[PDB]
Structures are given as structure tokens and as C-alpha cells.
From Swiss-Prot, chains A, B:
SUPFAM superfamilies: Nitric oxide (NO) synthase oxygenase domain. Its cofactor is heme; (6R)-L-erythro-5,6,7,8-tetrahydrobiopterin. It comes from Bacillus subtilis (strain 168). It catalyses: 3 reduced [flavodoxin] + 2 L-arginine + 4 O2 = 3 oxidized [flavodoxin] + 2 L-citrulline + 2 nitric oxide + 4 H2O + 5 H(+). InterPro entries: Nitric_oxide_synthase_Oase-su, NOS, NOS_dom_1, NOS_dom_2, NOS_dom_3, NOS_N, NOS_N_sf. Heme binds at residue 65. The lineage of its organism: Bacteria, Bacillati, Bacillota, Bacilli, Bacillales. Belongs to the NOS family. Bacterial NOS oxygenase subfamily. Its EC number is 1.14.14.47. GO terms for molecular function: heme binding; metal ion binding; nitric-oxide synthase activity. The keyword Metal-binding applies. The gene is nos. Keywords: Heme, Iron, Metal-binding, Oxidoreductase. PANTHER family: NITRIC OXIDE SYNTHASE (PTHR43410:SF1), NITRIC OXIDE SYNTHASE OXYGENASE (PTHR43410). CDD domains: NOS_oxygenase_prok. This is Nitric oxide synthase oxygenase.
Length: 362, 362
């Protein structure tokens, strides 16, 4: 069955991919090659064209992603050649550098060797390549609570955080054959961060908030034509609400709404005053203002929804079915001010796509 | 099959209802009575206890309703005795009066005779008993665009609106046997309205906004034990976001966000300024402030979500499965500031319940 699963997925992907690339005539011969290759080796190897277009299709098929208008401009870096942890580390360093691009963020994915027999060649432990540590002990809460389990795992391996609210976690990954992952501290020169200030409320800087420029998701599996690329970190730029309405706002994250209320000069005492809503607006204004002022790419939710509308239109014009997850596509503030809220979406799963996979720790 | 559908639904409802009422012992005999009655007449008649509890269960089962904590305190008015249009009209007038209760709103439902052979005895045309007219002609848009089709239908029947932005539509309903519905102007003394002012922005009154106190949904079918009560208007009080984030905010409703932005002194030019979000917060603050100041019941979305959390807990403690529609339960502003956003809900349909039915016009 496993071989057959591979072959069925391969057939489907190659036909669709080559059709999109105007390579329909080459489908028959390529399929035979793949079929022979699966018979002889138990798998097959993507051409660079297949890999690149596969990663793009996967983004295009990501139901939960509002940023899909730009799917075809994804920068795909083929690192199926890596064999050593130094090569992996350097590839991750490089991804950070080239994706960051001095603040003009380039949507980028680096693709490492795929699983062989369900056996990972490279196993990335980070949730994002750049993320803050979190600590919890004896009433004391420091940093990002979402990172507590990974932080504890790193500290088991000899890493030690300074215990600021914004410690950069090291890169941490394991190679096939090794019992333990290795870790490497991030060079600060590679990591752009943005201090959060408000366009007209001077006291906002008293909160000493900041966030990192580039979100680089590194724990999802890219599946293309039955091949499982468990290690394939990708990035875009942020939508502002991710930072201002979730990372800094959530009670189980940085939980800053009461402090925001205080610095903007409103009471945080009565639900009917809508102080949380007001704090959310000002914090989100501050986030967009700060990224723009520094020259780090970001998009607001209104602009992002407008871009997504064009993606919907483009899909229709191309004769492609549109899939989406309404519950993730609506922004977490003012959702009914976007067109997304007022329509429905088919949440069917189409491949290629990006998938969750079990954590290697905890 | 139709008889059998009735009998199956009856069996299920009576067992559950009587179990909840501690009347489990009386189930067997009541079922026989009903069974005989269905054989002889093609239907059956609810006891007042069954009717009252049925309407309450229906609210309790309404997946989309955040206000369900208070399901058991619904005031059920049995008007299965009405036979004339004057009796219907007076019953609707009465519902308005008693539900309004000088502003201390009482959740209330008035139940009219049920469908006989799918044949309605009373057919209500209004979407809500109290709602504003809408007009569209030659570039000119007046009032509530959502009411345009019903307004046009009323004007076919000899009613004429003053064409303010807030004309009260007449009650309009049809009796079995009549080709045309009848209409009756609402006595203004029965209709409480609230002018919208802001707690600290004096200019907000320049917008001359207002809304009606009591939303009374009159176009849904109450289904209890296989009986179809197509005419059974019900009300609660408003959650503030319904008025401030939808009725007054939606581009296809009153579309007031640009005007709100102007009176609160912010530019409405750049998406990144989040002026729509800011306008939404101030408009929603104004709505809550105004209803509270006048002494008309209303609930904010934070308080409503907290009440819904208790409903969830109460359901668990009672051994009842919880059903809900996440997409309607989240409020349309700051949804991620509520617990609802961060969990999932089973959207299964349980009866008794309230259902959509086709409009008798358009
Ligand atoms: C270019 C800018 C991009 C923006 C602004 C953007 C925006 C977003 C946002 C806001 C989410 C939802 C996260 C949340 O609500 O918590 C999301 C989800 C997602 N995006 Fe994008 N995205 C972009 C690019 C990309 C790229 C380049 C990829 C992959 C090649 C991608 C794949 C995804 C996936 C897989 C998810 C869902 C994650 C999950 O299910 O947990 N996006 N995107
Ligand atoms: C007591 C105060 C109540 C509040 C604050 C409340 C709140 C709400 C809200 C906010 C909605 C969603 C509307 C929207 O988002 O557009 C809703 C839906 C609903 N409520 Fe309640 N509700 C209350 C009482 C009731 C009562 C008394 C009933 C019936 C006996 C009821 C039945 C429903 C139904 C059927 C819906 C769904 C309508 C649809 O699917 O179109 N609610 N409620
Ligand atoms: N947003 C939700 N859940 C949620 C909860 C906790 C964390 C979380 O992180 C998304 C984070 O892992 C993530 C994943 C994918 C993309 C992003 N954001 C980005 N801009 C990009 C990262 C990489 C490419 S684009 C961020 C998402 C919900 C919607 C409805 C109910 S709950
Ligand atoms: N809220 C949504 N849709 C929507 C669109 C237009 C009108 C509308 O009116 C609800 C209105 O008919 C209605 C129905 C039932 C209850 C209420 N509000 C109330 N407080 C009550 C009326 C009667 C008892 S409680 C109001 C709802 C959506 C959620 C997610 C995607 S779209
Ligand atoms: Cl994030
Ligand atoms: Cl309404």
C-alpha cells in the first residue's frame, strides 16, 4: 500500500504540475521514469522545477492562509544536498539572512532532504527559527509562555537563557543517527527586531515591547507528490494582528492589554467601557506604525483581506477551485469589516500542502 | 411517512421533556394518548407545560445564540387560541409591551396556532416586529437597505413611509383563507428607541443615530415534537455589537463608519491607521453607553461571553451535550478576547429548535 500511495500521489501531482507549467506532453515519459524509480528504490526524486512549483502549490492550497495572493513568487531554496549539521545550521542562517533582506522581506522556503522510510534525515525542533524563550517557576513567569516546553528542552541540553522577556531561542535540530539534537545560538546581526512605539502616544515606549521581524515556521511538513519534506522552513511577513491581537495580547502569551490600557490613559475596570477593544486597536496601530517606521515589511488586516479577495478572483479566472478555512481567514479584530466574514469557504484539503507533525520533544 | 415523522419526533420530545420535568412516570400514558390522537386527527396538541418547556429547550438548542445561559427563564405566552387578525394584531402589540417592560427587557415568546397540513394558520411577514424601512431608487438610498424588499411589499399594499432613515414598518401578516396580508401601523407609545450618544465625544450626537430597544424575531419556525409553529415571535435583549458592529456599521446596512471617524476626529484615508477598527470601538462604546443611560437592557460582548461560559459549564454539570456554531458565537469585534474563539463547538442540530423558513414575499 505504501508504495501504491506514493505512486497514486505522484501520478496526481505530476499531471497537475506539468499541466500548470505547460509540460503536459512530458507527463507520460516522466511518469514511467518515476514508476521505474519507485519500483527500484522505493521512492523518487523531484526535479528542481517540480520541487519549486510543488512548494508554491502547497502555499496556494493552504486553507488557513490569507496571504495566498503571492503564492507564485515564493523563493524556493533547494537544500536536499545537506548531509552535516554544520550545513543545516548554515542553511538556516542563510534562510534568515535572505528572507530578511534588510527588512524588505522575501517569502522564502528552504527544503531539506525528505523522509526516507518515514525516517527523518533532519528533524527541526524549533517552532519558528526566530522565537522568544519562556519560563515558568515559583509564581514567576518570564518571556513567551508558548515557548516554555521547548525552552526547558533546550536547557536540558546545556543552553541557558538570560531570562529577559525576549531571549532568542537557539536553533535546535537533530540529524538522522544522532540520539540528541544540537543547538546553536543565533547571531544577533542576523535577527531584525522592532521596538513597539505609538504614532502619537509617547508613553507607549514605557511598555518596552518589541517583536521579531520575520516569522519563519519550521515545524510543518511539506508534502509534494507523496514525498514528505518534514524539514522545510518557510516565511512570509507578518499580518499586524498576529502580533498585536495575539502574540502580545493573549492572556496565555504576553498578556499586555491591561498595561496598554494604562499607558493610553483609560480605566481597565468595566466590560462595558470596551477597554480591551480600545487597547487592542491602539496596540495594533502601534505595531503597524513601528514596523513601517523601521522599514520592515508588514501588512494590515484590511489590506491583507483585499489581497485575498484578488486571490479568490484569480482562482476563479484560472478555473481552480478555491479552498479556505473561514475560522482562520477572518482577522481577530474587526473581522466583519472584511469581505471574508461575509462569505463561506470550502475547507477541503488539496495537495501539495503544509501539514502538522508531532513534536520531537515533550 | 409524514404521520410517522410526527410520531417519532413526538416520542423523542415527550421522553426528554418529561425526564427534565421529573415526569418520567407519565411518559407511557401520555405517549398512548398522543398516538391515539395522531391516528384519529393526523396531529396532536401540546399541553401548556410541554409547550413552555419545548420553547425553552429550543432556545437552549440554538447553536448560534450566545445568550443561552438564561434559557429557562423564557416567558412563554400561549396564543394558540387566536382566530382573527385583530386577535393576532393585539397579541403582537401585547408582546411588544410586555417584552419591553419599560426597558427592563423580558425574554418572551408568543406562540400562535401551528401549521396544520403544512398549511399556516397565521403567516407573519415581518423579519422583526420592530424594524426600520428601507428605500432605494435613482441613486437615492434611505433607511435600512435590509428592509428594502419588505418595504416595497408593504407599499404595494397601501402603506406609505415618510422616508426618514428610521421609519417603523407596520406589522404585516396573513391569515389562512386570505389572499392578501393585512398591515397595522405600530403605536409609537409601544416602541422604545435609544438615541446614540458617546460618553465623552459631544459631537457624536451630530450623527443623529438611534436604534430600537427590543429585537423581536418574527420569521422563524419553532419546532417542538414534530409540531411546526411557523408563527412564534421571540425576543431577548441586544448584544451591543449587533447594533454597533453590524446594523450601523455594515456597508450594506447603515454604513456609518466614515461618519463616525469624522466626528471622533480621525482621518479615514489609510488602512494602516486602523480607522475602521477605531471607529468600531467608539461606535460600540456609544451604543452601550446610550442603552445603559436610558435604562434599556443590553449586554456587551465580554459579559455575554462570560455568561456563555457559564452555560457551557451548566450543560456539562447537567450531563447535556453542548452544541454551538463557532462562526456565530464569536463576537464581530475583539473575538479573540473571548474564550469562545479559543475552543471548538459541535454544530449538530438538536430539536426542539428554531428554524429558517421561506419568505412569503419576494
Ligand atoms: C507573504 C506573507 C504572508 C502572510 C501575510 C501570511 C499570513 C498568514 C496568516 C495571518 C496566517 C494565520 C496565522 C494565524 O491566524 O494565527 C497564515 C497561515 C498560514 N500561512 Fe500564510 N502568510 C504569508 C505567507 C505564507 C507563506 C510564504 C507560506 C508557505 C509557503 C504560508 C503558509 C501558511 C500556512 C501553512 C498557514 C497555516 C498554519 C497552520 O495551520 O497552523 N504563508 N498566513
Ligand atoms: C436574552 C438575551 C439574548 C441575547 C443577548 C442573545 C444574543 C444573540 C446573538 C448575539 C445572536 C447572534 C445574532 C448575530 O450575530 O447576528 C443570537 C442568535 C440567536 N438567538 Fe439569541 N440572544 C438572546 C435571547 C434569545 C432568545 C430568547 C431566543 C429564543 C427563544 C434566542 C434564539 C436565538 C436564535 C434562534 C439565534 C439564531 C438566529 C439565526 O440563525 O439566524 N435568543 N442570539
Ligand atoms: N489563529 C488561530 N490559532 C492560533 C493559535 C495559537 C498560535 C497560532 O499561531 C500561528 C502561527 O503558528 C503561524 C502559522 C503560520 C503562519 C503565521 N504567520 C505568518 N505570517 C507566517 C509564518 C510563515 C509564513 S507566513 C503564523 C495560531 C485561530 C484561528 C481561529 C481559532 S484559533
Ligand atoms: N451574524 C451573522 N450573520 C448575520 C447577517 C445578517 C443579519 C444577521 O442578523 C441576525 C438577526 O436576524 C438576529 C437573529 C437572532 C437574534 C438576534 N439578536 C438578538 N439579540 C435577539 C433577537 C431575538 C431574540 S435575541 C438577531 C446575522 C454572521 C456570523 C458569522 C458569519 S455571518
Ligand atoms: Cl507568530
Ligand atoms: Cl438586529
Amino acid at each position: 500500500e505504501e508504495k501504491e500511495i506514493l505512486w497514486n500521489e505522484a501520478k496526481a501531482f505530476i499531471a497537475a504540475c506539468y499541466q500548470e507549467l505547460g509540460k503536459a506532453a512530458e507527463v507520460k515519459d516522466r511518469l514511467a521514469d518515476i514508476k521505474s524509480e519507485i519500483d527500484l528504490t522505493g521512492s523518487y526524486v523531484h526535479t528542481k522545477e517540480e520541487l519549486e512549483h510543488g512548494a508554491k502549490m502547497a502555499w496556494r492550497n493552504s486553507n488557513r492562509c490569507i496571504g495566498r495572493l503571492f503564492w507564485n513568487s515564493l523563493n524556493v531554496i533547494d537544500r536536499r544536498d545537506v548531509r552535516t549539521k554544520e550545513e543545516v545550521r548554515d542553511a538556516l542562517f542563510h534562510h534568515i539572512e535572505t528572507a530578511t533582506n534588510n527588512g524588505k522581506i522575501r517569502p522564502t522556503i528552504t527544503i531539506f532532504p525528505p523522509e526516507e522510510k518515514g525516517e527523518k534525515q533532519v528533524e527541526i525542533w524549533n517552532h519558528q527559527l526566530i522565537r522568544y524563550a519562556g519560563y515558568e517557576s515559583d509564581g514567576e513567569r518570564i518571556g513567551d509562555p508558548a515557548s516554555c516546553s521547548l525552552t526547558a528542552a533546550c536547557e536540558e541540553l546545556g543552553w541557558r537563557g538570560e531570562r529577559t522577556d525576549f531571549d532568542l531561542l537557539p536553533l535546535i535540530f537533530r540529524m538522522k543517527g544522532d540520539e540528541q539534537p544540537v543547538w546553536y545560538e543565533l547571531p544577533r546581526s542576523l535577527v531584525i527586531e522592532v521596538p513597539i512605539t505609538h504614532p502619537d502616544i509617547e508613553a507607549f515606549s514605557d511598555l518596552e515591547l518589541k517583536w521579531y521581524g520575520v516569522p519563519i515556521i519550521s515545524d510543518m511538513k511539506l508534502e509534494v507528490g507523496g514525498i514528505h519534506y518534514n524539514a522545510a522552513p518557510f516565511n512570509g511577513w507578518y499580518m499586524g494582528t498576529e502580533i498585536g491581537a495575539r502574540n502580545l495580547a493573549d492572556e496565555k502569551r504576553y498578556d499586555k492589554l491591561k498595561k496598554v490600557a494604562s499607558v493610553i490613559g483609560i480605566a481597565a475596570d468595566y466590560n462595558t467601557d470596551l477597554w480591551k477593544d480600545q487597547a487592542l486597536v491602539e496596540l495594533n496601530k502601534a505595531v503597524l506604525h513601528s514596523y513601517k517606521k523601521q522599514g520592515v515589511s508588514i501588512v494590515d488586516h484590511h489590506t491583507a483581506a483585499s489581497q485575498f479577495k484578488r486571490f479568490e478572483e484569480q482562482a476563479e479566472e484560472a478555473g481552480r477551485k478555491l479552498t479556505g478555512d473561514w475560522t482562520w481567514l477572518i482577522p481577530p479584530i474587526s473581522p466583519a469589516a472584511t469581505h471574508i466574514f461575509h462569505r463561506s469557504y470550502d475547507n477541503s484539503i488539496v495537495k501539495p500542502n503544509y501539514f502538522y507533525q508531532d513534536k520531537p520533544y515533550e
